Amino acid sequence: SKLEAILSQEVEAEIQALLQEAEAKAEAVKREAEEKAKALLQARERALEAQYRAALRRAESA
């Protein structure tokens, strides 16, 4: 009974550790997704602006 109770307390500690690991993994995944979306949107907007500038330069030369 005491050893089954100690193993149940350890199982509760392991369940808390698993919930904390799942929460930390979800937080790191959301952070990485936000960083990737920010870098992709910045790259796409800068590429659109640079293409517009180069096309305006070639059109003004013409």
Binding site: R57, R58, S61, A62
Partner: protein, 159 residues
């Protein structure tokens, strides 16, 4: 042709690390071609209209189907304009003299029509002086901010 095209479209002097402020003037291309065939001609002019350089460049085209002795006049005629636009207007003229091997074959033809004693592999002796008077009309002068930088393209026969 593609190396010359990439240095034609995306080469730029960097003023900021030189420490002079900036004036950041882009180049001016004197493209003189001596017996490029048709495909290289198509590639160069479409590359220049895609980079938008034909509003600041000149072409002296002397194609493959052109006659074969005016190749002697083509580079000197181009570099006359190069000297002009450098040393009277403060420019940064880059000169692409394509395929000097056709110039040297035309020089060989005019040297062998006049019986003249050649040096090595049938080329006449004054080829040194004529390639000198093509090349050394280039460099920078004191005080005048005009300048000439040449890319002559050779084609090594047996590489």
């Amino acid at each position: 042709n593609e190396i010359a095209a990439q240095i034609a479209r995306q080469a730029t002097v960097r003023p900021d690390l030189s420490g002079e402020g900036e004036k950041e003037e882009p180049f001016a291309v004197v493209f003189a071609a001596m017996g490029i065939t048709q495909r290289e001609l198509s590639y160069f002019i479409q590359e220049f209209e895609r980079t938008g350089a034909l509003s600041r460049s000149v072409l002296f085209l002397n194609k493959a189907d052109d006659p074969t002795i005016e190749r002697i006049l083509t580079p000197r005629m181009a570099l006359t304009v190069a000297e002009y636009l450098a040393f009277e207007h403060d420019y940064h003229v880059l000169v692409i003299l394509t395929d000097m091997t056709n110039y040297c074959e035309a020089l060989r033809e005019i040297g062998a029509a006049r019986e003249e004693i050649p040096g090595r592999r049938g080329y006449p002796g004054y080829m040194y002086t004529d390639l000198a008077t093509i090349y050394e009309r280039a460099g920078v002068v004191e005080g005048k901010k005009g300048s000439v930088t040449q890319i002559p393209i050779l084609s090594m026969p047996d590489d």
